[PDB]
């Protein structure tokens, strides 16, 4: 069993996705044709990392995952790199709105009593990259 | 084991014991930690 | 202390005999004897045995916790058995029993043929499995230790004689 | 390595080291290192204990040294006979009496301070003890 953070659009390039789960024993070209039946739906390049409940010899059926938060932050900042240590340099402080438009992402699949609480965890990665609120 | 005048617990799993008038350290996790006072 | 102050309960079918310090217990597995230290009053007062110190002996309670554990192992030992297993690891390692002898083959030029004591019995469901049975707890760890001593498990591959209890820590050889 | 900038005289009599100390209370910090024993503390010893202090604590708090090696010690070099004048100054010692606070520290918790002084104390030739500030 070998895992790597696999592309949704590309299947069987040899370094990054060949070992990914086409070499686990999952059908990569029916994961990433069935998952790509699901990432024919998904936005242009969200690595939405599912949990694999799979078999060895060409059979499969997958459970699914919620799309990321870390990949979706850097859009309106105008940058595609990162700091060595945030809270000294920031990548342009962004709105609640985009941190709340990323809070649209992990809402449908949590168990809270009062749903306001999870706006804190979305900003355990915010200060940890520089995305502090006004 | 290592034999020295000063014998000490080097980890939690170490244990002091006196066996024939000799302070020793036994460790279940690291044989490097075995010590005899001497 | 807590060990001594918990009484030794004897179940049905174990005849006990207190001749002062010298004390023996009889069972289906067989007679077992002990000669306790002078600092231990041992008493029949029930269908149990009780352990406490004899005034005039500083050790005292220490011996009584010892004595308690011993008889408990004896009382258990005569009714039910003590059984230590030993698993052999090694491509060409194997064991066989001939009656009161275990003929071990452990990668030696000579053959290892270990002789058992009076009340220990060894079987082998597998070429690489020894299974002792005996009333005494001390003799069966002494025998299992001796058998373990011929080929004590080496760390790298875990090759040798191991107790099946034994968990062996494996290390990797010096790089390059 | 501490040493007087200037001294009135080059060489001092051997003297004696009797009595209890002055500078017996912690005066500048919260915690201190107090001598129990008696004996000379050389400048090299004081610097080594100080080096070990300031590293057990990393840029944390403040450290004071309450002793100063102001006494010059002499040695005749190897293969010189007795006499022919007093020897040459080789090192500087502070005379220590039982009770002398040797170093003081604040700005760190106690527990780090117990550990800092334990390492420093290993460098010194005198029994020591941890001590705390006292009110009135």
């Amino acid at each position: 069993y070998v895992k790597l953070q696999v592309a949704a659009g590309m299947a069987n390039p040899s370094p990054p996705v060949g070992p990914a789960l086409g070499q686990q024993g999952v059908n990569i070209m029916e994961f990433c044709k069935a998952f790509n039946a699901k990432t024919d739906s998904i936005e242009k390049g969200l690595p939405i990392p599912v949990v694999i409940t799979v078999y060895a010899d060409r059979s499969f059926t997958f459970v699914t995952k919620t799309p990321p938060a870390a990949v979706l932050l850097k859009k309106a900042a105008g940058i595609k790199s990162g700091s060595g240590k945030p809270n000294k340099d920031k990548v342009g402080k962004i709105s609640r709105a985009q941190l709340q438009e990323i809070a649209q992402t992990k809402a449908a699949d949590m168990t809270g009593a009062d749903i306001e609480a999870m706006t804190r965890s979305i900003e355990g990665t915010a200060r940890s990259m520089g995305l502090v609120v006004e | 084991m290592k034999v020295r005048a000063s014998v000490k617990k080097l980890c939690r799993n170490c244990k002091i014991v006196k066996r024939d008038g000799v302070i020793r350290v036994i460790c279940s996790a690291e044989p490097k930690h075995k010590q005899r006072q001497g | 202390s807590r060990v001594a102050k918990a009484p030794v309960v004897v179940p049905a079918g174990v005849d006990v005999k207190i001749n002062g310090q010298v004390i023996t217990i009889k069972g289906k597995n067989g007679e077992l004897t002990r000669t306790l230290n002078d600092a231990v009053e041992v008493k029949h007062a029930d269908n149990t045995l009780t352990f406490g110190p004899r005034d005039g002996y500083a050790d005292g309670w220490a011996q009584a916790g010892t004595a308690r554990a011993l008889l408990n192992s004896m009382v258990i030992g005569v009714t039910e058995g003590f059984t230590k297993k030993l698993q052999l690891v090694g491509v060409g390692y194997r064991a066989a029993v001939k009656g009161n002898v275990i003929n071990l083959s452990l990668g030696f030029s000579h053959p290892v043929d270990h002789q058992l004591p009076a009340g220990i019995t060894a079987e082998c469901p597998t070429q690489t499995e020894i299974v002792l049975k005996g009333a005494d707890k001390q003799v069966i760890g002494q025998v299992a230790a001796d058998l373990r001593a011929y080929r004590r498990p080496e760390p790298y591959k875990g090759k040798g004689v191991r107790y099946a209890d034994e968990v062996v820590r494996t290390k990797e050889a010096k790089k390059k | 390595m501490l040493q007087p900038k200037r001294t009135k005289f080059r060489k001092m009599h051997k003297g004696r080291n009797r009595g209890l100390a002055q500078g017996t209370d912690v005066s500048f910090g919260s915690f201190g290192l107090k001598a129990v024993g008696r004996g000379r503390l050389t400048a090299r010893q004081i610097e080594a204990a100080r080096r070990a202090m300031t590293r057990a604590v990393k840029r944390q708090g403040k450290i004071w040294i309450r002793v100063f090696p102001d006494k010059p010690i002499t040695e005749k070099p190897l293969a010189v006979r007795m006499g022919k004048g007093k020897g040459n100054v080789e090192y500087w010692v502070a005379l220590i009496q039982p009770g002398k606070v040797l170093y003081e520290m604040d700005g760190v918790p106690e527990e780090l301070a117990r550990e800092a002084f334990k390492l420093a104390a290993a460098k010194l030739p005198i029994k020591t003890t941890f001590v705390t500030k006292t009110v009135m």
Binding site: - | - | - | L20, D25, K34, A35, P98, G99, V135, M136
Partner: protein, 94 residues
């Protein structure tokens, strides 16, 4: 809270004071007001444990000698040079 149960010193000075500290008592003195000074010997560990607290050297304290409850403040304290012991206390009345 601090109620020190004290006795009166029958002999004074160095020999007598050392004889006390060898017996887990230490000398002390009460002064102030216009009453004459009063030399007391205290039990060491009793006073030792109480002066560990902070409100021993700031609040009013009371010393009982011959039954009489004498109120005081702690004024000066002679500590041992290199031990957690006590040589002498000055108590001022208040």
């Amino acid at each position: 809270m601090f109620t020190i149960n004290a006795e009166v010193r029958k002999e004074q000075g160095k020999g007598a004071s050392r004889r006390l500290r060898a017996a887990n008592k230490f000398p002390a003195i009460i002064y102030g007001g216009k009453e004459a000074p009063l030399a007391i010997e205290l039990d060491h560990d009793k006073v030792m444990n109480m002066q560990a607290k902070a409100e021993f050297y700031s609040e009013v304290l009371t010393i009982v000698v011959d039954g009489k409850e004498i109120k005081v403040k702690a004024q000066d304290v002679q500590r041992h040079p290199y031990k957690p012991k006590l040589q002498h206390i000055d108590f001022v009345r208040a």
